[PDB]
Amino acid sequence: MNPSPRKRVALFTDGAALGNPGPGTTNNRMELKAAIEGLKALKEPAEVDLYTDSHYLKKAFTEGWLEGWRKRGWRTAEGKPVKNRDLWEALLLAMAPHRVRFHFVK
Numbered sequence: 001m002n003p004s005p006r007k008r009v010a011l012f013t014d015g016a017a018l019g020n021p022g023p024g025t026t027n028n029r030m031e032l033k034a035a036i037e038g039l040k041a042l043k044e045p046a047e048v049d050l051y052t053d054s055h056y057l058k059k060a061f062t063e064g065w066l067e068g069w070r071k072r073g074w075r076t077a078e079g080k081p082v083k084n085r086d087l088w089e090a091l092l093l094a095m096a097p098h099r100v101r102f103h104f105v106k
Contacts, residue, residue: 008048013032
C-alpha cells in the first residue's frame with residue numbers, strides 16, 4: 001500500500017509572496033524556508049515531489065553545479081558569497097536523509 005520506494009509526498013512550495021521587500025526573491029526564499037521545514041519537520045526518508053515554481057530553486061538544481069558549489073567554497077557565478085547559504089547549507093544537510101525530488105512546475 002502507498003508508493004513502493006518509501007513514501008512519495010506531494011509538497012507544493014507555495015510560500016506566499018508578499019515579503020516586506022516583495023516576491024522579488026523573498027517568495028523563493030520563503031518557499032525555500034518552507035522547504036527546509038518541510039524536510040526537517042519530517043525526518044522521515046521520503047520521495048518528496050517538491051513542486052517549486054521559483055527561478056532560484058530551479059536554477060540551482062537545474063544547473064547541476066550544486067556539486068561545484070561545494071567545491072566552490074560557495075560563491076555566486078560571479079565570485080561573491082551565496083545568498084541564503086544558511087538556508088541552503090541547512091536544507092542540504094536536511095536533504096541528505098530524504099530523496100526529495102525536484103519538480104519545477106512553471
